[PDB]
Amino acid sequence: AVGRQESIHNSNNIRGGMHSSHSLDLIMRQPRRVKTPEQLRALRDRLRFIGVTGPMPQATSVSTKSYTDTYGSRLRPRYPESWDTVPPHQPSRELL
Amino acid sequence: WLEACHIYLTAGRKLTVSCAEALITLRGRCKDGGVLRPLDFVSVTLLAQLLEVVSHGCCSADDLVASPVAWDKVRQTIQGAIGEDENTIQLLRAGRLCVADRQATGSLV
Amino acid sequence: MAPELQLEYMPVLFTRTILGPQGGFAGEERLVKLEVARKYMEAGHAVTPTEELRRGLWCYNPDTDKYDCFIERNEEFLDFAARKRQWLDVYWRVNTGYLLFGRQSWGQGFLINCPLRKRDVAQKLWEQYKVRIDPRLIEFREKDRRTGIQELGHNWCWLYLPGAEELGINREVYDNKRVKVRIHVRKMNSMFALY
Amino acid sequence: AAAAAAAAAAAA
Amino acid sequence: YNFEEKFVYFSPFDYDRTFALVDQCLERAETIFNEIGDVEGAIRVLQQRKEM
Amino acid sequence: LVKRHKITNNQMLLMRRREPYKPTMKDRQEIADRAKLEEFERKNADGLMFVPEKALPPWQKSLAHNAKALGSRINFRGFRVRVADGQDEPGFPTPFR
Amino acid sequence: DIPQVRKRIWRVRHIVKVDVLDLDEAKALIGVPEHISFTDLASQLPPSFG
Amino acid sequence: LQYFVPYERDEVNPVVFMDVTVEGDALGRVSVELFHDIVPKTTENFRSLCTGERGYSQCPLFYKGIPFHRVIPGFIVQGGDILLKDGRGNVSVFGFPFPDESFEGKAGKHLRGTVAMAHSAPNQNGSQFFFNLARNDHLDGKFVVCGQVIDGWEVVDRVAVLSGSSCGTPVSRAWITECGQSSGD
Amino acid sequence: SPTDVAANISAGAMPPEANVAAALPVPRIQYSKWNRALRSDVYDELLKLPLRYKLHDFAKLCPPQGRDSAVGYLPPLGPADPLDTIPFFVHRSSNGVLPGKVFSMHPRNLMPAFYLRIQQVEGDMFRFEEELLKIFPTKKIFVRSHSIYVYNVALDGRMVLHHWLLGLGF
Amino acid sequence: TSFEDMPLYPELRSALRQLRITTPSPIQQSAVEVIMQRKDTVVAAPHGEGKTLAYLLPLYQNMIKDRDVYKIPLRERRPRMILLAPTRELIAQLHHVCSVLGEATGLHAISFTSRKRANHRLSRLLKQQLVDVMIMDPKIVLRLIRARRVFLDDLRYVAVDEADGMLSSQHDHDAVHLLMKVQKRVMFKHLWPVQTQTVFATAFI
Amino acid sequence: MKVSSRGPIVRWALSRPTSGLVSSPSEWRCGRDLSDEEKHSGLLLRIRDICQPLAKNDQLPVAVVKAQPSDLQVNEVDAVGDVAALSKVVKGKWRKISRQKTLLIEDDARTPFSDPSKSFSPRVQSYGEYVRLTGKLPRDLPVLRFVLYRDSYSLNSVENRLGYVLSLQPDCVFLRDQPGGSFGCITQHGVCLGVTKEILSHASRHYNLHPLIFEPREYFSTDKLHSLLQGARGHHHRVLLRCVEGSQDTIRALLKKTAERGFINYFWLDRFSVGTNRFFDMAVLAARGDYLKSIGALLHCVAESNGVHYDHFLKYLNADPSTVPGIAQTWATTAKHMRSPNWIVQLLRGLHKYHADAECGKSSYLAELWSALPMREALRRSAAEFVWNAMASQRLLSKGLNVVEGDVVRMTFKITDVVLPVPYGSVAANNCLFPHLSPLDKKLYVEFATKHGMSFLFDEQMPSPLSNPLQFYRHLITKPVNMQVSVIRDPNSLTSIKSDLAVMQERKLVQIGDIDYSTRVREPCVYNVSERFTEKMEEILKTHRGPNSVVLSCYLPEDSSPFVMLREVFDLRHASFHDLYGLL
Amino acid sequence: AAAAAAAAAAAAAAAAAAAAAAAAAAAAAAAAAAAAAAAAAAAAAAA
Amino acid sequence: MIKMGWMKIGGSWKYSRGYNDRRRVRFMLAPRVSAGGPRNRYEGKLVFSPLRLSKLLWAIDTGRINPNEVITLYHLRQANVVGEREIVWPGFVLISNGVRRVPYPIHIELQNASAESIRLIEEAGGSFTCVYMTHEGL
Ligand SMILES: Nc1ncnc2c1ncn2[C@@H]1O[C@H](COP(=O)(O)OP(=O)(O)O)[C@@H](O)[C@H]1O
Ligand SMILES: [Mg+2]
Incomplete structure (x- = not known):
């Protein structure tokens, strides 16, 4: 939130009354949770991609198997199809 | 014309004023030369040598090739050569003036 | 600055002041197109640069109406002449133009829905004449002091140019403290007409 | 005799 | 134009989940047979998958 | 008649042109002419290739072949028939010339 | 926010109302960890979406 | 470290060269021998993509000027997504993702210098490939091996070191500048 | 071929002696129903393409130099792989020509849009269709009890189809 | 409203003084500016406002600019300007009006018409004297181009004196074919960029 | 068993050069730098490296050379002293x-x-x-002497044009090779047998962007054939470098020091192609008998040179052994149709026969094809020149500028007089007086030849071609007799120099003695170069910030490429380099 | 279609960018003359 | 309807008049090359129908034509390699379309043949006779 071009309007309005973006403003006011580039790189390395096309490392544990390997690409779990929880449909269409 | 000029200007073979005048006349009545409405440097040098030979001891080849004024002075000195020779001398002077206009060129021998 | 640009241009020293885009101030050495450069040179308003001219140059003094005012072409004189020519150029650009405006007028009507303001006049001046000015300089007439222009057809206002007294433009213009900006409002296409 | 080592042989 | 409707295709792997389940089960059975070294079992299971 | 269209909202009712993002007829003609001229200039960027006899249009190929028929049956280099229907001279040097 | 989009918005600024969102603001709006990158999200999401 | 060619070179097998450039800095040239005796279809696909012989179907079928969208310091060096250089879409010269040919022996074992064709499905190969960087047991039988590396392995390792990350996303841009076919060497 | 001879000559790469190459294609013996000129490049492309059925040797396809023929007529061979069974069988005409015949969509208007119509296929018409999908991925293919229509195809496509059929046992 | 206002060389000013031209006709006032700006132009005038000078004097100014400032070289069979006129008498008149300007400005203009040995005479003229301007019928110009006696390599100006007849079928569209050849030359890229401009003087449109 | 090669197949041009940018590789587009190729071809050492204790301590100024055919102009000077100049134009x-x-x-x-x-x-x-109009040929003076000016034609292309237009055989025409790349304008004397003036003029082509113009001068008897064939004794080179870093003062100082100190007389890459495999590589392959690999390398170089050949070579390489005969037949037919040289057409036909018929499927047929190939002598000469370059580099490394008990030219001798032999066969190896030095001598020559596979040029002999007779003694370093330079400012590189044909067209005469700034040199303006040239040069300008353009005219004594001197002075890059592919 | 689309985009850009042209008397556009920026009587404050 | 496409039989006829006009149902500037026009089939003109040498060889290879006999137009017709539509006088002309060699001698009797086809037959070793006929003979 440091160094905004909307500081004048913010002072005029927000400080007097709440705005729809109050939560966003609070988040911007709060300091960033990634303090250093070293921490950023550590978190990025920890990050894991599942849908990527290429292979994935498995040195962590041989017994650990991927869902695609266990069940294959053409098979997906029977998601609970309900108004509250709607799953993706037709993975064949999804492919391309 | 160039072959005759070579065989005559050859140091071993001495020249005469009459022969130089004849060569000047032939260069005037040349065919395969450049249009004369500048002139080739080789022909200009040969003609300057012929003119300094005609001048009867006034060796001014360097002056002719360096300064255009030398061409006017030689034209005034010469009297026998009249006609196309005047135009030839004028165009040679123009060509040498154009050549001397350039000094950026460096002869890094 | 490229060789071709220099070939199609030619340096020239301005004996007097010419306010055209290809002109200059007295003693200015500038690269000008061959056509207008030859025009000025034959008219006597400019001359080919030389060492003696650069060290000092003769110019035109209207008091005697002759090219008989010798002046040294030093840095301070060059700066002052540049400033004076800039002032005169702004004045001439404002006076010899017709500030077009495209606004919306619902139906036929007689005036525009959104009146023009000093900010709008300044922006149009920058867009057309490429002149930057403080909007406070622009002053509307008595008829337009309260609600802006708010009228189609031919309109004009006043543009104040300070510094004329310092620079010495007393007798070189009609009024050295004012400039008449002449405006023309019109209904234009949707893309050109905003607001 | 350093050129022999400098210029390696090639057989296309 | 709009001729993709003349070739509209619906994948049985998506419109019949039992077929996909059995296909995966037969693939795993074939892999197990190959690991064990059996040949007749792999041949029969692959042929049944093809017939399905 | 006017092509009526199934609407999806009152904005389609208010709409007059079916494709507002499409230039009017005159602008379409201008843009098409500019595009065709640009394509033609791109094609002609290289010189006018002198295509052989076999590549000439159907109405020049046979005439040229008949004109040069005798030379084809009696082979000797330097035989050229100055036919009239051949490709016209461009007027400038070209890479293919 | 690129020069072409800015050109288009400038051209059609009288039919369009614009709101700005820095990358930080957009990331907060969507609610994703700061260490994750929109480039990573784009690479993950499918190309045949719509 | 030292690099040993995994298998024995075969004069019959085709050779494909590619130059790798990182952030505008040239590194060298990598030569790959494709196992044409065991996987002719994938060999032809890879060779055609590297050479640019075929024209365009959905995108220029040419590895030239394409980045390595996924690099890991010590697992793989992947790249060659002709259609979506970001690394999402997978395309083939044949026009459709072709299936895996055979994982028997030479084409089923992944080794250090080995190269393979990445696929988004267990039976849909494409354009993007990856060089291995160490014995990858878990990849055996899953990804088809297209060939081995003869020269430029140092270039591949340097590219991995420069633009690698356990996340997989490259740190610095690295791409292919000039790729084509070669002769036996 | 990817090369543009005219563009190369214009740039200065190739010599100006390739004007004929830039103008008209290289001479050949055009593939016709009365002359089976087997293009080695076409057959090589068929071999490289990932088809499910093995093809025969091009040396076997070409006649000797069973008797030699200038046109290049040979009786149908057998399947390349005896173990495998071809799901479809293709019959030859009374003259031995293959089924592929190219028609036009609007012959009355002389429309330049042509479609190939394969016939005399007796086995799995749909397996034949799938092979045609592999060969011509981008073309529209329809199947009927009596014929298979491949649209946006012409004499070149008929030649490719006939090469594929000859590579097969048929 | 003045030749003095118009940017003209002293040679052109002397030429017009010799011709006794002192005040520009409105057609000249309107056309000199554009022809100097180097845009394809169509000048129209009611038969005697000075179209000849209007489309000649600016073209000669441009040719002098090319020869001196740009220093474009002059070749043998590649003229700078091609002028077209239907009748032999008009060709001769244009040759005179161009010869006065050529004598004034150092340029050279030729003209040819039907004679006893037309081919021999024209070829001899071309071989002998390289020219800057050629005033000739479009039919003869096309003959020369097709026989590659002349080339459009250095051609930069095309002028038509009777555009109506020249572009109509009354003159076989020879001017149209020549202009299409000029357009092809302009499109051609391997030669130095020549922005050939066409001027059409026409008492009727 | 198909033929093969060793190096990668890189197509220098593009499949469709529509934007003017011809080079396909990005670095080649930005400028081709042949430093690595020269190092591999023998040009290991530099005079500045010898002088300075360190090598490449200061990076040489960057320059781009012969981006336009008019940039490089070469005029021959025969032993008689007459220069080769375009006098007048005569049409067939x-x-x-x-x-x-x-x-x-x-x-x-x-x-x-x-x-x-x-x-x-x-x-x-x-x-x-x-x-x-075939003229009348007197029987007493069959030899015809002429001068040939070719804009961007290779000598092989000129010979092919003479052969097919005139129906003569290659041995009937004798044209001495001219140093410098064939891309630039080259004017040279020539001698032909049994040809008349009219037909020799018909052999030319005047209406092409790249003019190839012939003109006879006089007839001569067969007695003076050897005298006419004697090698030329000079070459006038006019060069124009487009983008040179630095200033006029420093450029002129560099050229002054180069002229004063001379330059090494290396055999520039004009003798050995720039491809991955060189002429000497092909020669050594043929000598050791691997005719299959030799023909494979020949086809590889031809493919790199020509686009269509590149298209067909890859198809042949990747063709199944079943369809390879048909691919070879198609390649031969395409070569015949596009009218490629008869030697390559016959080579492709023989390759097709070798792959088709089992009778020819043996190394004997390939050996016969190679023997029929007319380039063998050229390849062997290239190998000898490579050996000479290596030996000269070793000599300079060991001894240096100073002369000690070294071979000199027999008119205290100087380094300019110092000479080294180039072994053109056993006859040369015997007759020539090799230097008597402990490190460098005939023994080291033989060792280098054996280790590089060029032992044939010492084991056996090679005939001296009549067109360009052998020169066994080649000086170590050379100094231009005359050298004039001019520098202009043109950051966008619009400068140009008029060619001999341009001067002839504008009716002025052609002068070869010195650079003609007033006539030859054209000031920078947009109307100096083509739009295609600007499109081609924009990529170079986006990389090389060279504000200076250098126009130089120099004289070289017997046979020397000005690019060697320009390499010793600057770091030069060739925008146009396809001319270096000698074959085809 | 690519050429037509490019031409349409160029036409739209040309017809929508140069909303107004400087007066010909001040500077003739057809003669290549252009007017520079005169910031003499300007201000720096964000007015 | 011309300007509106296919319209239902129901109605909407008001905006269609060209349809009714069509329902109710330059050369002058070009010269005549000859009195009969170009490619005029005047009586007695020799306009032979093509007979591909490749087609004849294919028929021989398949087995519809016996090489051991002297081929004639009657034999071709009976073998059904040609149809009655293309039997007009003067008859057929042999054309070597895409044929470079004839592996075996062939003896033929057609009403005309190309020089290339005759050369190919003679080189192969067969024979050809141009049996030109009248209508009665044919
Ligand atoms: N400013 C001018 N003032 C006087 N006479 C002019 C002027 N311009 C052209 N002319 C003269 O007027 C006459 C007609 O000129 P001309 O150009 O031949 O007519 P047109 O425009 O029909 O071709 C000529 O005698 C010409 O010299
Ligand atoms: Mg008139």
Whole structure:
């Protein structure tokens, strides 16, 4: 939130009354949770991609198997199809 | 014309004023030369040598090739050569003036 | 600055002041197109640069109406002449133009829905004449002091140019403290007409 | 005799 | 134009989940047979998958 | 008649042109002419290739072949028939010339 | 926010109302960890979406 | 470290060269021998993509000027997504993702210098490939091996070191500048 | 071929002696129903393409130099792989020509849009269709009890189809 | 409203003084500016406002600019300007009006018409004297181009004196074919960029 | 078993160069730097490296050379002293053998054909038939001496044009190779046998962007054939470098020091192609007998040179052994159709026969094809020149500028007089006086030849070609007799120099003695270069910030490429380099 | 289609960018003359 | 309807008049090359129908034509390699379309043949006779 071009309007309005973006403003006011580039790189390395096309490392544990390997690409779990929880449909269409 | 000029200007073979005048006349009545409405440097040098030979001891080849004024002075000195020779001398002077206009060129021998 | 640009241009020293885009101030050495450069040179308003001219140059003094005012072409004189020519150029650009405006007028009507303001006049001046000015300089007439222009057809206002007294433009213009900006409002296409 | 080592042989 | 409707295709792997389940089960059975070294079992299971 | 269209909202009712993002007829003609001229200039960027006899249009190929028929049956280099229907001279040097 | 989009918005600024969102603001709006990158999200999401 | 060619070179097998450039800095040239005796279809696909012989179907079928969208310091060096250089879409010269040919022996074992064709499905190969960087047991039988590396392995390792990350996303841009076919060497 | 001879000559790469190459294609013996000129490049492309059925040797396809023929007529061979069974069988005409015949969509208007119509296929018409999908991925293919229509195809496509059929046992 | 206002060389000013031209006709006032700006132009005038000078004097100014400032070289069979006129008498008149300007400005203009040995005479003229301007019928110009006696390599100006007849079928569209050849030359890229401009003087449109 | 090679197949040009940018590789587009190729070809050492204790301590200024054919101009100077200059242009004469054919077509359509007064008018179908005017050739003076000016034609292309236009054989024409790349304008003397002036003029082509113009001068008897064939004793080189870093003062200082100190007389890459495999590589392969690999490398170089050959070579390489004969047949047919040189057409036909027929499927047929190939002598000469370059580099590394018990030219001798032998076979190896130095000598020559596979040039002998006779003694370093330089400012590189044909067209004479700034040099303006040239040069300008353009005219004594001197002075990059591919 | 689309985009850009042209008397556009920026009587404050 | 496409039989006829106009159902500037026109089939003109040498060889290879006999137009017709549509006088002309060699001698009797086809037959070793006929003979 440091160094905004909307500081004048913010002072005029927000400080007097709440705005729809109050939560966003609070988040911007709060300091960033990634303090250093070293921490950023550590978190990025920890990050894991599942849908990527290429292979994935498995040195962590041989017994650990991927869902695609266990069940294959053409098979997906029977998601609970309900108004509250709607799953993706037709993975064949999804492919391309 | 160039072959005759070579065989005559050859140091071993001495020249005469009459022969130089004849060569000047032939260069005037040349065919395969450049249009004369500048002139080739080789022909200009040969003609300057012929003119300094005609001048009867006034060796001014360097002056002719360096300064255009030398061409006017030689034209005034010469009297026998009249006609196309005047135009030839004028165009040679123009060509040498154009050549001397350039000094950026460096002869890094 | 490229060789071709220099070939199609030619340096020239301005004996007097010419306010055209290809002109200059007295003693200015500038690269000008061959056509207008030859025009000025034959008219006597400019001359080919030389060492003696650069060290000092003769110019035109209207008091005697002759090219008989010798002046040294030093840095301070060059700066002052540049400033004076800039002032005169702004004045001439404002006076010899017709500030077009495209606004919306619902139906036929007689005036525009959104009146023009000093900010709008300044922006149009920058867009057309490429002149930057403080909007406070622009002053509307008595008829337009309260609600802006708010009228189609031919309109004009006043543009104040300070510094004329310092620079010495007393007798070189009609009024050295004012400039008449002449405006023309019109209904234009949707893309050109905003607001 | 350093050129022999400098210029390696090639057989296309 | 709009001729993709003349070739509209619906994948049985998506419109019949039992077929996909059995296909995966037969693939795993074939892999197990190959690991064990059996040949007749792999041949029969692959042929049944093809017939399905 | 006017092509009526199934609407999806009152904005389609208010709409007059079916494709507002499409230039009017005159602008379409201008843009098409500019595009065709640009394509033609791109094609002609290289010189006018002198295509052989076999590549000439159907109405020049046979005439040229008949004109040069005798030379084809009696082979000797330097035989050229100055036919009239051949490709016209461009007027400038070209890479293919 | 690129020069072409800015050109288009400038051209059609009288039919369009614009709101700005820095990358930080957009990331907060969507609610994703700061260490994750929109480039990573784009690479993950499918190309045949719509 | 030292690099040993995994298998024995075969004069019959085709050779494909590619130059790798990182952030505008040239590194060298990598030569790959494709196992044409065991996987002719994938060999032809890879060779055609590297050479640019075929024209365009959905995108220029040419590895030239394409980045390595996924690099890991010590697992793989992947790249060659002709259609979506970001690394999402997978395309083939044949026009459709072709299936895996055979994982028997030479084409089923992944080794250090080995190269393979990445696929988004267990039976849909494409354009993007990856060089291995160490014995990858878990990849055996899953990804088809297209060939081995003869020269430029140092270039591949340097590219991995420069633009690698356990996340997989490259740190610095690295791409292919000039790729084509070669002769036996 | 990817090369543009005219563009190369214009740039200065190739010599100006390739004007004929830039103008008209290289001479050949055009593939016709009365002359089976087997293009080695076409057959090589068929071999490289990932088809499910093995093809025969091009040396076997070409006649000797069973008797030699200038046109290049040979009786149908057998399947390349005896173990495998071809799901479809293709019959030859009374003259031995293959089924592929190219028609036009609007012959009355002389429309330049042509479609190939394969016939005399007796086995799995749909397996034949799938092979045609592999060969011509981008073309529209329809199947009927009596014929298979491949649209946006012409004499070149008929030649490719006939090469594929000859590579097969048929 | 003045030749003095118009940017003209002293040679052109002397030429017009010799011709006794002192005040520009409105057609000249309107056309000199554009022809100097180097845009394809169509000048129209009611038969005697000075179209000849209007489309000649600016073209000669441009040719002098090319020869001196740009220093474009002059070749043998590649003229700078091609002028077209239907009748032999008009060709001769244009040759005179161009010869006065050529004598004034150092340029050279030729003209040819039907004679006893037309081919021999024209070829001899071309071989002998390289020219800057050629005033000739479009039919003869096309003959020369097709026989590659002349080339459009250095051609930069095309002028038509009777555009109506020249572009109509009354003159076989020879001017149209020549202009299409000029357009092809302009499109051609391997030669130095020549922005050939066409001027059409026409008492009727 | 198909032929093969060793290096990668890189197509220098593009499949469709529509934007002017011809080079396909990005670095080649930005400028081709042949430093690595020169190092591999023998140009290991530099005079500045010898002088300075360190090597490449200061990066040489960058320059780009011969981006336009007019940039490089070469004029020959024969032993007689007469220079090769374009005097006058003579066109091929034709004789009309037939009368124009006309057909009568109806003059009017209203009048019926049945009317006797029907009016018909003639229309011409054929203007007539013409035949080249073969002149009369005296039997006492069969040898014809002429001068040839070629804009961007290789010597092989010129010979092919003479052969197919005139129907003569290659041994009937003798043209001495001219240093410098063939891309630039080159004017040289030439001698032909059994040809007449009219047909020799017909052999030219005047109406092409790249003019190839011939002109005879006089007839000569067969007795003076050897005298005419004697190697040229000079070359006038005019060069124009487009983008050179630095300033006028420093550029002139560099050129002054180079002229004063001379430059090494290396055999520039014009002798050995720039491809991955060189002429000497092909020669050593043939000598050791691997004719299969030799022909494979030949086809590889041809493919790199030509696009269509590149298209077909890859198809042949990747063709299944079943369809390879058909691919070879298609390649041969395509070569014949595009009218490639007869030697390559026959080579491809023989390759097709070798792959098709089992009778020819043996190394004997390949050996026969290689023997029929007419390039063997050229490849062997290239190998000898490579050996000479290596030995000269070793000599300079060991001894240096100073001369100690070294071979000199027999007119205290100087380094300029110092000479080294180039072994053109066993006859040269015997007759020539190799230097008597402990490190460098005939023994080291033989060792280098054996280790690089060039032992044949010492084991056996090679004939001296009549067109360009051998020169066994080649000086170590050379100094230009005359050297003039000019520097201009043109950051966008629009400068140009007029060519000899341009001067002839504008009717002025051609002077070869010195650079003609007033006539030859054109000041920078947009109207100096083509739009294609600007599109090609924009990529170079986006990389090389060279504000200075250098126009130089130099004289070189016997046979030397000015690019060697320019390499020793600057770091030069060739925008146009396809001319270096000697074959095809 | 690519050429037509490019031409349409160029036409739209040309017809929508140069909303107004400087007066010909001040500077003739057809003669290549252009007017520079005169910031003499300007201000720096964000007015 | 011309300007509106296919319209239902129901109605909407008001905006269609060209349809009714069509329902109710330059050369002058070009010269005549000859009295009969170009490519005029005047009586007695020799306009032979093509007979591909490749087609004849294919028929021989398949087995519809016996090489051991002297081939004639009657034999071709009976073998059904040609149809009655293309039997007009003067008959057929042999054309070597895409044929470079004839592996075996062939003896033929057609009404005309190309020089290339005759050369190919003679080189192969067969024979050709141009049996030109009248209508009665044919
Ligand atoms: N400013 C001018 N003032 C006087 N006479 C002019 C002027 N311009 C052209 N002319 C003269 O007027 C006459 C007609 O000129 P001309 O150009 O031949 O007519 P047109 O425009 O029909 O071709 C000529 O005698 C010409 O010299
Ligand atoms: Mg008139």
